[PDB]
Design a protein that fits this description.
The structure holds 3 chains of a larger assembly. With about 20 residues, chain A is mainly β. Chain A contains no helices and 2 strands. In chain A, a hairpin with a 2-residue loop joins β1 (about 1-10) and β2 (about 10-15). Chains in contact: A-B, B-C. At the A-B interface, β2 of A face β1 of B. The PDB classes it as antibiotic.
């Protein structure tokens, strides 16, 4: 349920666990 | 138990395993 | 926030539009 997200320039990449 | 997501334009595509 | 997920044993792939 917690995500680590890195965003820039119209894109977000997220890794989510619990 | 992990979902990896990429979001653009409000559209997110996620792959979840383990 | 409208999502679909398609799963096989061991993997789910989701697409969320909002």
């Amino acid at each position: 349920g917690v995500c680590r997200c890195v965003c820039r320039r119209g894109v977000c990449r997220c890794v989510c666990r619990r």
